[PDB]
Amino acid sequence: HHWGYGKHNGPEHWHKDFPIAKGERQSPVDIDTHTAKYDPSLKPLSVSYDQATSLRILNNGHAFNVEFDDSQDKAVLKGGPLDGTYRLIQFHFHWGSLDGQGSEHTVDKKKYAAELHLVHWNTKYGDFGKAVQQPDGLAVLGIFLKVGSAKPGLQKVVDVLDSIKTKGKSADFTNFDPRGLLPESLDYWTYPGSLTTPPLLECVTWIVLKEPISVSSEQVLKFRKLNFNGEGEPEELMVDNWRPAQPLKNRQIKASFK
Numbered sequence: 001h002h003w004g005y006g007k008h009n010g011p012e013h014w015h016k017d018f019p020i021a022k023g024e025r026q027s028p029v030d031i032d033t034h035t036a037k038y039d040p041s042l043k044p045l046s047v048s049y050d051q052a053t054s055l056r057i058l059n060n061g062h063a064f065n066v067e068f069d070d071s072q073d074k075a076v077l078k079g080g081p082l083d084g085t086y087r088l089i090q091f092h093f094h095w096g097s098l099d100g101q102g103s104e105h106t107v108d109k110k111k112y113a114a115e116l117h118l119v120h121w122n123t124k125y126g127d128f129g130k131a132v133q134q135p136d137g138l139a140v141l142g143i144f145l146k147v148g149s150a151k152p153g154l155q156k157v158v159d160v161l162d163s164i165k166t167k168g169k170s171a172d173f174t175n176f177d178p179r180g181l182l183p184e185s186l187d188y189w190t191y192p193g194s195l196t197t198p199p200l201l202e203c204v205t206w207i208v209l210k211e212p213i214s215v216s217s218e219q220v221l222k223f224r225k226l227n228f229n230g231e232g233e234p235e236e237l238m239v240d241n242w243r244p245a246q247p248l249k250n251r252q253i254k255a256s257f258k
Protein backbone atom coordinates (compact mmCIF):
# COMPACT_ATOMS: atom_id res chain seq x y z
CA HIS A 1 0.00 0.00 0.00
CA HIS A 2 1.20 3.52 0.94
CA TRP A 3 4.96 3.94 1.42
CA GLY A 4 6.37 3.75 4.94
CA TYR A 5 9.22 2.30 6.98
CA GLY A 6 7.92 -1.22 7.49
CA LYS A 7 9.32 -4.48 6.12
CA HIS A 8 6.86 -4.41 3.22
CA ASN A 9 6.72 -0.70 2.37
CA GLY A 10 10.08 0.50 3.63
CA PRO A 11 13.09 2.16 1.90
CA GLU A 12 13.94 -0.95 -0.12
CA HIS A 13 10.43 -0.88 -1.61
CA TRP A 14 10.14 2.78 -2.58
CA HIS A 15 11.78 2.34 -5.98
CA LYS A 16 8.69 0.53 -7.30
CA ASP A 17 6.46 3.61 -7.11
CA PHE A 18 9.29 6.16 -7.08
CA PRO A 19 11.87 5.16 -9.76
CA ILE A 20 14.19 8.04 -8.85
CA ALA A 21 14.96 6.05 -5.69
CA LYS A 22 17.89 4.63 -7.66
CA GLY A 23 18.74 7.96 -9.26
CA GLU A 24 22.10 9.72 -9.46
CA ARG A 25 21.76 12.15 -6.56
CA GLN A 26 19.79 10.44 -3.82
CA SER A 27 19.95 11.26 -0.11
CA PRO A 28 20.97 10.57 2.54
CA VAL A 29 24.60 9.56 2.02
CA ASP A 30 27.49 8.62 4.28
CA ILE A 31 29.77 11.59 4.95
CA ASP A 32 33.37 10.42 4.56
CA THR A 33 35.06 13.24 6.47
CA HIS A 34 38.47 12.33 5.05
CA THR A 35 37.26 12.39 1.45
CA ALA A 36 35.26 15.60 1.93
CA LYS A 37 37.25 18.54 0.56
CA TYR A 38 37.40 22.06 1.96
CA ASP A 39 36.03 24.54 -0.57
CA PRO A 40 37.27 28.16 -0.63
CA SER A 41 34.54 29.30 -3.05
CA LEU A 42 31.98 28.68 -0.31
CA LYS A 43 30.56 31.98 0.94
CA PRO A 44 29.78 32.43 4.63
CA LEU A 45 26.56 30.60 5.56
CA SER A 46 23.74 32.83 6.82
CA VAL A 47 20.94 31.53 9.02
CA SER A 48 18.51 34.38 9.78
CA TYR A 49 15.71 32.94 11.92
CA ASP A 50 15.00 35.90 14.25
CA GLN A 51 11.81 36.82 12.37
CA ALA A 52 10.60 33.20 12.23
CA THR A 53 6.86 32.60 12.53
CA SER A 54 5.92 29.07 13.60
CA LEU A 55 2.26 28.25 12.95
CA ARG A 56 1.50 24.62 13.78
CA ILE A 57 2.80 21.12 14.46
CA LEU A 58 1.39 18.10 12.65
CA ASN A 59 1.72 14.33 12.51
CA ASN A 60 1.77 13.26 8.84
CA GLY A 61 2.13 9.56 9.61
CA HIS A 62 5.88 9.59 8.85
CA ALA A 63 7.15 12.22 11.29
CA PHE A 64 5.96 15.54 12.72
CA ASN A 65 6.36 18.86 10.95
CA VAL A 66 6.53 22.29 12.55
CA GLU A 67 5.39 24.55 9.73
CA PHE A 68 6.19 28.24 9.33
CA ASP A 69 4.65 31.18 7.51
CA ASP A 70 6.67 31.50 4.30
CA SER A 71 4.51 34.15 2.61
CA GLN A 72 7.33 36.63 3.29
CA ASP A 73 11.06 36.44 3.91
CA LYS A 74 11.08 35.99 7.70
CA ALA A 75 13.31 32.99 8.26
CA VAL A 76 15.81 32.59 5.45
CA LEU A 77 18.94 30.61 4.66
CA LYS A 78 21.57 32.25 2.44
CA GLY A 79 25.29 32.05 1.73
CA GLY A 80 27.29 28.84 1.75
CA PRO A 81 26.81 26.93 -1.54
CA LEU A 82 23.49 28.71 -2.07
CA ASP A 83 22.72 31.21 -4.81
CA GLY A 84 19.91 33.46 -3.69
CA THR A 85 17.50 33.30 -0.76
CA TYR A 86 15.70 30.24 0.63
CA ARG A 87 12.70 30.47 2.98
CA LEU A 88 12.09 28.13 5.90
CA ILE A 89 8.81 26.31 5.40
CA GLN A 90 9.03 23.49 7.93
CA PHE A 91 11.28 21.29 10.03
CA HIS A 92 10.95 17.72 11.23
CA PHE A 93 13.13 14.93 12.59
CA HIS A 94 14.08 11.32 11.84
CA TRP A 95 14.85 9.06 14.80
CA GLY A 96 15.40 5.45 15.79
CA SER A 97 14.00 2.85 18.16
CA LEU A 98 17.30 3.05 20.06
CA ASP A 99 19.85 5.82 20.75
CA GLY A 100 22.38 4.08 18.50
CA GLN A 101 20.42 4.72 15.31
CA GLY A 102 18.06 7.31 13.87
CA SER A 103 19.97 9.79 11.72
CA GLU A 104 19.69 9.59 7.95
CA HIS A 105 23.08 10.98 7.02
CA THR A 106 26.04 9.36 8.75
CA VAL A 107 29.56 10.60 9.49
CA ASP A 108 32.27 8.07 8.69
CA LYS A 109 29.48 5.51 8.97
CA LYS A 110 28.54 6.79 12.44
CA LYS A 111 24.79 6.96 13.09
CA TYR A 112 23.34 9.51 15.52
CA ALA A 113 20.20 9.11 17.64
CA ALA A 114 18.23 11.41 15.34
CA GLU A 115 18.51 14.11 12.69
CA LEU A 116 16.84 17.51 12.35
CA HIS A 117 15.82 18.79 8.91
CA LEU A 118 15.00 22.47 8.40
CA VAL A 119 13.45 22.71 4.93
CA HIS A 120 13.75 25.86 2.80
CA TRP A 121 12.73 26.69 -0.78
CA ASN A 122 14.39 29.00 -3.32
CA THR A 123 12.42 32.27 -3.44
CA LYS A 124 13.26 32.80 -7.12
CA TYR A 125 10.70 30.06 -7.85
CA GLY A 126 7.71 31.76 -6.24
CA ASP A 127 6.32 28.92 -4.14
CA PHE A 128 7.39 25.61 -2.63
CA GLY A 129 5.36 23.72 -5.23
CA LYS A 130 7.27 25.20 -8.18
CA ALA A 131 10.57 24.93 -6.32
CA VAL A 132 10.34 21.13 -6.28
CA GLN A 133 10.50 21.13 -10.08
CA GLN A 134 13.98 22.66 -10.04
CA PRO A 135 17.49 21.17 -9.60
CA ASP A 136 18.18 23.86 -6.97
CA GLY A 137 14.65 24.34 -5.67
CA LEU A 138 15.38 23.34 -2.08
CA ALA A 139 17.99 23.63 0.64
CA VAL A 140 17.71 21.41 3.70
CA LEU A 141 19.77 22.20 6.77
CA GLY A 142 20.51 18.94 8.56
CA ILE A 143 21.48 18.77 12.20
CA PHE A 144 22.47 15.63 14.12
CA LEU A 145 21.11 14.93 17.56
CA LYS A 146 23.18 12.97 20.08
CA VAL A 147 21.90 11.73 23.44
CA GLY A 148 23.33 13.46 26.50
CA SER A 149 22.29 16.78 28.05
CA ALA A 150 18.81 18.13 27.42
CA LYS A 151 18.36 20.76 24.72
CA PRO A 152 16.29 23.56 26.28
CA GLY A 153 15.08 24.81 22.91
CA LEU A 154 13.57 21.42 22.07
CA GLN A 155 11.34 20.90 25.12
CA LYS A 156 8.44 22.96 23.76
CA VAL A 157 8.28 20.53 20.83
CA VAL A 158 8.54 17.50 23.10
CA ASP A 159 5.70 18.61 25.40
CA VAL A 160 3.22 19.19 22.56
CA LEU A 161 3.76 15.72 21.07
CA ASP A 162 0.98 14.24 23.23
CA SER A 163 -1.56 16.36 21.35
CA ILE A 164 -0.59 14.95 17.93
CA LYS A 165 0.02 11.31 18.79
CA THR A 166 -1.62 9.96 15.63
CA LYS A 167 -1.45 10.49 11.89
CA GLY A 168 -3.58 13.42 10.78
CA LYS A 169 -3.54 15.28 14.09
CA SER A 170 -2.20 18.82 14.32
CA ALA A 171 -1.97 21.51 16.97
CA ASP A 172 -1.34 25.24 17.05
CA PHE A 173 2.38 25.82 17.61
CA THR A 174 3.04 29.55 17.39
CA ASN A 175 5.97 31.61 18.64
CA PHE A 176 8.46 28.71 18.54
CA ASP A 177 12.02 29.92 17.89
CA PRO A 178 14.05 27.44 15.77
CA ARG A 179 17.28 29.19 16.79
CA GLY A 180 17.01 27.14 19.97
CA LEU A 181 17.75 24.01 17.91
CA LEU A 182 21.00 25.22 16.33
CA PRO A 183 24.42 24.07 17.54
CA GLU A 184 27.20 26.50 18.39
CA SER A 185 29.25 26.07 15.22
CA LEU A 186 28.00 26.50 11.66
CA ASP A 187 30.76 24.36 10.12
CA TYR A 188 29.10 22.14 7.52
CA TRP A 189 29.36 19.70 4.61
CA THR A 190 27.30 20.27 1.47
CA TYR A 191 26.39 18.25 -1.62
CA PRO A 192 23.57 17.97 -4.22
CA GLY A 193 20.93 15.48 -3.18
CA SER A 194 17.23 14.75 -2.81
CA LEU A 195 14.33 14.46 -0.38
CA THR A 196 14.89 11.42 1.84
CA THR A 197 11.24 10.36 1.60
CA PRO A 198 8.99 9.81 -1.43
CA PRO A 199 8.69 11.40 -3.93
CA LEU A 200 12.49 11.53 -3.37
CA LEU A 201 12.78 14.53 -5.72
CA GLU A 202 16.39 15.44 -6.56
CA CYS A 203 15.99 19.18 -5.96
CA VAL A 204 18.06 19.56 -2.81
CA THR A 205 21.27 21.25 -1.88
CA TRP A 206 22.10 19.55 1.41
CA ILE A 207 23.88 21.44 4.14
CA VAL A 208 24.69 19.16 7.07
CA LEU A 209 26.14 20.74 10.20
CA LYS A 210 29.24 19.09 11.65
CA GLU A 211 28.55 19.83 15.32
CA PRO A 212 25.64 17.81 16.72
CA ILE A 213 23.21 19.24 19.23
CA SER A 214 22.73 17.16 22.36
CA VAL A 215 19.30 16.16 23.62
CA SER A 216 18.31 14.15 26.69
CA SER A 217 17.35 10.50 26.67
CA GLU A 218 13.88 11.49 27.89
CA GLN A 219 13.45 14.04 25.10
CA VAL A 220 14.15 11.39 22.42
CA LEU A 221 11.97 8.88 24.22
CA LYS A 222 8.92 11.09 23.81
CA PHE A 223 9.56 11.11 20.04
CA ARG A 224 9.19 7.32 20.14
CA LYS A 225 5.73 7.48 21.71
CA LEU A 226 4.24 8.97 18.55
CA ASN A 227 2.21 6.83 16.14
CA PHE A 228 2.51 6.10 12.42
CA ASN A 229 -1.13 4.98 12.29
CA GLY A 230 -4.32 7.01 12.46
CA GLU A 231 -6.39 7.50 15.62
CA GLY A 232 -8.81 4.62 15.09
CA GLU A 233 -6.27 2.18 13.68
CA PRO A 234 -3.89 -0.32 15.37
CA GLU A 235 -0.91 1.26 17.13
CA GLU A 236 2.48 1.26 15.44
CA LEU A 237 5.13 3.28 17.22
CA MET A 238 6.75 6.00 15.11
CA VAL A 239 10.38 4.87 15.31
CA ASP A 240 13.14 4.21 12.79
CA ASN A 241 11.58 6.63 10.30
CA TRP A 242 14.94 7.10 8.53
CA ARG A 243 16.22 6.14 5.07
CA PRO A 244 19.64 4.43 4.99
CA ALA A 245 22.68 5.93 3.22
CA GLN A 246 22.48 5.89 -0.57
CA PRO A 247 25.27 5.59 -3.19
CA LEU A 248 27.24 8.82 -3.52
CA LYS A 249 27.84 7.95 -7.19
CA ASN A 250 29.20 10.91 -9.16
CA ARG A 251 29.21 13.41 -6.31
CA GLN A 252 31.72 15.18 -4.07
CA ILE A 253 31.07 16.39 -0.53
CA LYS A 254 32.53 19.82 0.19
CA ALA A 255 33.42 21.09 3.65
CA SER A 256 33.07 24.73 4.65
CA PHE A 257 35.95 24.29 7.06
CA LYS A 258 39.62 23.37 6.61
Ligand SMILES: Nc1c(F)cc(S(=O)(=O)Nc2nnc(S(N)(=O)=O)s2)cc1Cl
Nearest residue numbers: 018019020021132133134199200201202
Ligand atom coordinates in the same frame (compact mmCIF):
# COMPACT_ATOMS: atom_id res chain seq x y z
N1 LIG B 1 10.59 18.97 -12.14
C1 LIG B 1 11.36 17.86 -11.78
C2 LIG B 1 11.39 17.43 -10.40
F1 LIG B 1 10.71 18.04 -9.52
C3 LIG B 1 12.17 16.33 -10.01
C4 LIG B 1 12.95 15.62 -11.00
S1 LIG B 1 13.95 14.25 -10.56
O1 LIG B 1 14.00 14.12 -9.11
O2 LIG B 1 15.27 14.41 -11.12
N2 LIG B 1 13.34 12.96 -11.18
C5 LIG B 1 12.15 12.42 -10.82
N3 LIG B 1 10.98 12.70 -11.40
N4 LIG B 1 9.93 12.03 -10.78
C6 LIG B 1 10.42 11.28 -9.82
S2 LIG B 1 9.58 9.96 -8.98
N5 LIG B 1 9.04 10.53 -7.59
O3 LIG B 1 10.48 8.88 -8.76
O4 LIG B 1 8.47 9.51 -9.77
S3 LIG B 1 11.85 11.98 -9.22
C7 LIG B 1 12.93 16.03 -12.38
C8 LIG B 1 12.14 17.14 -12.76
CL1 LIG B 1 12.16 17.57 -14.18
Ligand SMILES: Nc1c(F)cc(S(=O)(=O)Nc2nnc(S(N)(=O)=O)s2)cc1Cl
Nearest residue numbers: 117119132140194195196197198199201
Ligand atom coordinates in the same frame (compact mmCIF):
# COMPACT_ATOMS: atom_id res chain seq x y z
N1 LIG C 1 6.51 17.59 -4.04
C1 LIG C 1 6.75 17.64 -2.65
C2 LIG C 1 8.11 17.70 -2.20
F1 LIG C 1 9.10 17.66 -3.04
C3 LIG C 1 8.39 17.68 -0.82
C4 LIG C 1 7.34 17.71 0.16
S1 LIG C 1 7.74 17.99 1.89
O1 LIG C 1 7.07 16.93 2.64
O2 LIG C 1 7.30 19.24 2.33
N2 LIG C 1 9.12 17.87 2.05
C5 LIG C 1 9.83 16.87 2.59
N3 LIG C 1 9.95 15.61 2.12
N4 LIG C 1 11.17 15.05 2.45
C6 LIG C 1 11.85 15.84 3.27
S2 LIG C 1 13.55 15.59 3.78
N5 LIG C 1 13.61 14.36 4.76
O3 LIG C 1 13.99 16.74 4.45
O4 LIG C 1 14.38 15.33 2.66
S3 LIG C 1 11.26 17.44 3.16
C7 LIG C 1 5.97 17.66 -0.30
C8 LIG C 1 5.67 17.69 -1.68
CL1 LIG C 1 4.21 17.63 -2.13
Ligand SMILES: [Zn+2]
Nearest residue numbers: 092094117196
Ligand atom coordinates in the same frame (compact mmCIF):
# COMPACT_ATOMS: atom_id res chain seq x y z
ZN1 LIG D 1 13.83 14.79 6.69
